[PDB]
Each structure stands twice: as C-alpha cells, then as structure tokens.
Design a protein around this ligand. Structure first.
Ligand SMILES: [Ca+2]
Ligand SMILES: [Ca+2]
Lengths: 345, 345
C-alpha cells in the first residue's frame, strides 16, 4: 500500500477510546493500518493528562498502544509533550501551582525517558504560536506567541527551549518536532513560525524538524502559498526536517462568503460528487509540493489525521457534513487515496 | 409522554440533513417525537442560507419539515430569522453588499410571511450578545454586542429592533423571541441581556419572549445562578415569556481544571456511570427552577436539543465523549428522562 511507495514514514492517527474507531476493537481498521501505513500517531491517548492517574504517572494505556504498533509494523510519533488545551492539561499545569516549573520538568523528563527508544519522534511543543481564530486563553498575541499557562508561568517563550533540551537529554534518539496549524497559509503565522524557529536555532536548541498540521480545505490555502510556507522553513537550515503531521482535506469551506457551493447533506458526497474529485487532486498536489520542496533526507513523514471519514474530527464541522480522509464510511479507498498513490509514484 | 405532563410546549430539535438522525428516514425517531413531544425546532434546515437557492428563495425542504410537523402533532419553533455564523449567511449578507439593508428587509419579510400561520414561534434574533468565548468576527465587544455583519452594516444594534418590527408585521400571530446562550450563568452576559431587553422594551419593539439555550454541564452553572438569571428577565416585564430553547447537559467539564474527573472512553457511560445519575438530578433541577421562576401563562416551552445521544452536537466535544440527551444510543430512555417526568409531575 501507501507505505511501500515512499522511503519516509507514511502515518495515520488512530483512536483508542472505545466506539467504532477504536484500533484495538476494529480489526478492519487494524488491517488498513497494517496494509497501508508504517507509522501511527495517537489521536488522543498520548496527550498530557493521559500520562497521569491524578498525580502519579500512568503509562499503562499508552504502553498498550506503543506495543501494538511495535508488533504491527508501525513506528510511533508521540503527540505531544507540551500543549495548552485545558481538557488535556495535567492537574499541575495551573497558574496557582508555585512548583510549576519543577512539575513541568518532571513531565518532560519522565515521559520522554519512559518511551526512550520506543517512539521515533515527538511533537515536543504543539501550537505555541498565537492564532487569531483560536485563542482560548483570551490574552491575545505576545509577540507572535500564544499566552498559554506555560508562557505565563515561564514569562515568555523560553519554556519552548527548555522542553526541547529536556526531551533531548531524556531520549537522545528521538526526532524532536515543533508542530502547528495554519502555518501553511503563508501569512502572519508563517512569519511567526520562521522567527520562532530562527530563535531556537540561534540559541542552540536541539530541534530536529518542523511539523505542519495541514488541516486544509479543497481550495484554501492555494498550493503556491503552501509551497512557499514550506520553502521558507527548509531555507532556515541545511538539515532541519519537514513533517506533515495531521493532513485532512475539507470539501466544505464555510469562510469563503459563498453558501451556494456548500454540501449540506450527508448523502451529497457519500459516493460521487465534484468535491470528491477535487479532493483527489488536492491530496495529490499537496504530496507533490512536499516531495518537490523537501529534499530527500529531510522528509520527516506524511501523516493523515484518521483512517475512515466517520472517525474524523471534521466529519462534522460548522454544522456541515464533510468527508476529509482517504477511506469512506465503508472503509473503501476514495479518489483521495489514488491522488496520494499518483503523487508518491 | 412528556408533552402530556405540561401545559406548555415540550419540544425537540430534529435533524433532516441525511445520516442516522434524519427524521424523514428514521421511523424510530419519528415514533419518539410522536410519543413524547409536541413541538419541533429544525436543528439546521431553517437557518438563513437554507432559505435560498443562490439568490432566489427556496422553501422546498423547510416546507416538507413544517408539513411533517403539522401532520404528526407538532408545532414548530422557527430557528432562526437572523444569525451571524458564516456557514449559514445568505450571499447578500456581506460588507461588500451596497443593498444589505434592503436584502435584510426582504429576508425577514419573505420568510416570516411565507411561514405565517405555520410556525408558532421564531427565534427572531439569535446570539446578538458579545461572548468572550465565541467571537469569530474578531472585533470584540461593542457595548455588550457582537459586531457581526448585521451590527456593522447598521452601525449599531438597531438591526435587532428592525428584525422584530418586520417579523411582527409579516406574521402577527407568531411569538417573537430573542435567543442566546451563557445568559443563565448570571455573569457579564446576563447583564448585557438585561441591557438588550430593557432597550427593546424601551424602544417599543414587539418582543414576546426571551430564549435561554441552556447548553449546560452537570455541575456548572449552579442552579442558584440559573434561577437568578431567569428571575432577572422575568422581572423586566409583566408579560414577557421565557423559553428554554436548546437544553442539553454535558457529563464532562473540561473547564474545571481537573482532568481526573473526565470520562475519556465511549464505554464509560454507555450503560451506567455516576454522571448519568447526576444528569437525572440536573435535568430535574433545571425544569423545577423553570416552573418555580416563570409564571404559568408566561411559559414559552422547554426544548431539548436532539433525540438520542449520538445525534447530539456534543456527542463529542473538546475531544471527549459525552452523553447529553434523554435517549441513549439505543433510543432507550435514560435516567435523564425520569428527572424530567419527575419535575413535570
Ligand atoms: Ca462555501
Ligand atoms: Ca473535568
């Protein structure tokens, strides 16, 4: 399948929290992963709070998934050491906690050391950049940075340098990624990414690569913008790796000022519609831009953000159905799957 | 069923956009509606852009639903004449449209007149108040108002006055509501709701009632605050109705700073768990508060926001499973349903 077409990881996000998408329980999903992919990212269960039972570390459920990957031909991309959303914050990660920096170091040291040579790569820090459309903390932009509890407790972005350094000491074999979304738009957040990254390289911070989420729509951003965004990063260093971490492709755009081109019914694109054909071309042109802009030896992987459309976070979004992935509600390849094969080939 | 225990509308949101929850297609859902409820709101298909095919009005799909309702014992609550989210804006509702005010008028006048004796009540304006959590326009607060396209085009909140006057002229029998969420917290948004409603009452605007969406969690906000919030609005006018429009109850609170009390697994509360028992009590206490606070005669209805848990918008939220409604994944009544019957009894 897909993995055989590339010399770098071709990954998928897997669910492990019950219900239909559960990788342990869905032997049909297992067989797609075994046939098509060679790396897994935990969709949720390696997020920060999942490392804890109250205040003790607890790795039973995540060790389960990593041991599954190992026996099923998959490396694992660890997602994620440091990330802000309150639902996944350990209980220590509070403005009130005066031992915050200590508990922050023990987290990185303990988790990275625990998975030492069982995980290929980490999102060491995820989503550190201010995003106008996504600021739950409310605080607005601090020089390009999100003012999350980590920023607030460290007084600045130096929690980023510290997470890299600590992870690198704890596991000297792990590929260490900075990961974020909307940095492919080639706008203000892409510029903040380049400055973020230049600063870490200037400081001697051990970062191995930059992760682009790539949660895109069929027709936005344009690929010239995605191309340029990636080019700008590849230019920063002779060595720095580029990984597409979270690739999914929305047929619907609710931000384009045009409600007349929206698919509003679940039946619209269950078998055949123009949007599925554009989706084949859109997956194709992104994987092409990747191969063209990212030299061999610096390709960290392409990962798609789930197995089958009904598993997707976006199978609904903005009160609109969508069909964002390579496999359809029946676990059958979509024209999207072909676009990726044609690009990789 | 529930509707037989009250002398005000006992309603439910129904889906009609394909898949499992589609009311035209699920005889099992139809039978539940016929048994339990006497009012429907369309979850989606009565939103603004659904009234159009391109630039022309198209009432075909919404007429089918309204026909459905009248045939199966249901009144209809219209949702909504005026609302900001971009996914549902007709093509006219643009800063680039020199005819905005004309197109705005023609929308209200046409849709209201078209449903005139067919829909009992309207959300006339929905979500006009600024919410710190929910500002996609990016503009912040203008004196407690959301600076939506309607607010910008009017230079202020007088689009609200106009929408109520035009609905009243176009369908003089419809009960005319203002609807909003987080106004039950008794915080800053309750205070802005107070200003909003005072102003309309002051201007002589024909508002009939205030809707509380009531998207709550098991333990937040407290019913003391929910009680006082409603009291504050009942206090404004000797005749203003109160309606519960969008009631659902989350077991998971990912805002309480504790990731140790979350249910992370779809199986957690599939059969029984403590959250389901609290949920019975939560539904019960909210309906009791309603009955206590809102005089008979001023009771606009209680509506629950969907039929069965998997139909719910919150069946997943913040990456966590949830179980928000009165019927379970198997269309069996949950303890939630008893809490309602108890409060109504
Ligand atoms: Ca669109
Ligand atoms: Ca919680």
């Amino acid at each position: 399948g897909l993995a055989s077409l590339a010399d770098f990881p071709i990954g998928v996000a897997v669910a492990a929290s019950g219900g239909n998408a559960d990788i342990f329980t869905s032997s049909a999903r297992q067989n797609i992963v075994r046939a098509e992919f060679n790396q897994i990212t935990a969709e949720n269960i390696m997020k920060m709070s999942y490392m804890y039972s109250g205040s003790n570390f607890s790795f039973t459920n995540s060790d389960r998934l990593v041991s599954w990957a190992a026996q099923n031909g998959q490396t694992v991309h660890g997602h994620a050491l440091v990330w802000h959303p309150s639902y996944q914050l350990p209980n220590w990660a509070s403005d009130s906690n005066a031992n915050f920096r200590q508990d922050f170091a023990r987290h990185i040291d303990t988790v990275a050391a625990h998975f030492a040579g069982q995980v290929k790569s980490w999102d060491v820090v995820n989503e550190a950049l201010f995003d106008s459309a996504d600021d739950p903390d409310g605080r607005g932009s601090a020089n390009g940075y999100r003012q999350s509890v980590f920023y607030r407790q460290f007084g600045g972005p130096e929690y980023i340098d510290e997470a890299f350094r600590r992870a690198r000491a704890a596991d000297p074999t792990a590929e260490l990624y900075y990961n974020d979304f909307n940095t492919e738009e080639n706008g203000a957040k892409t510029t903040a990414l380049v400055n973020l990254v230049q600063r870490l390289l200037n400081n001697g911070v051990p970062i191995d690569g930059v992760g682009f989420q790539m949660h895109v729509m069929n027709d936005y951003p344009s690929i010239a913008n995605i191309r340029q965004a990636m080019q700008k990063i590849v230019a920063l260093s002779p060595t720095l790796k580029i990984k597409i971490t979270e690739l999914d492709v929305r047929l619907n755009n609710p931000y384009d000022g045009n409600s007349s081109n929206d698919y509003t019914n679940r039946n619209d694109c269950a078998v055949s519609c123009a949007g599925l054909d554009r989706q084949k071309a859109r997956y194709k042109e992104i994987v092409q831009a990747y191969l063209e802009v990212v030299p061999p030896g610096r390709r960290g992987g392409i990962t798609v953000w789930g197995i089958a459309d009904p598993d997707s976070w976006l199978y609904t979004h903005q009160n609109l159905p969508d069909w964002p992935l390579l496999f359809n509600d029946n676990l059958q390849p979509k024209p999207a799957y072909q676009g990726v094969v044609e690009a990789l080939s």
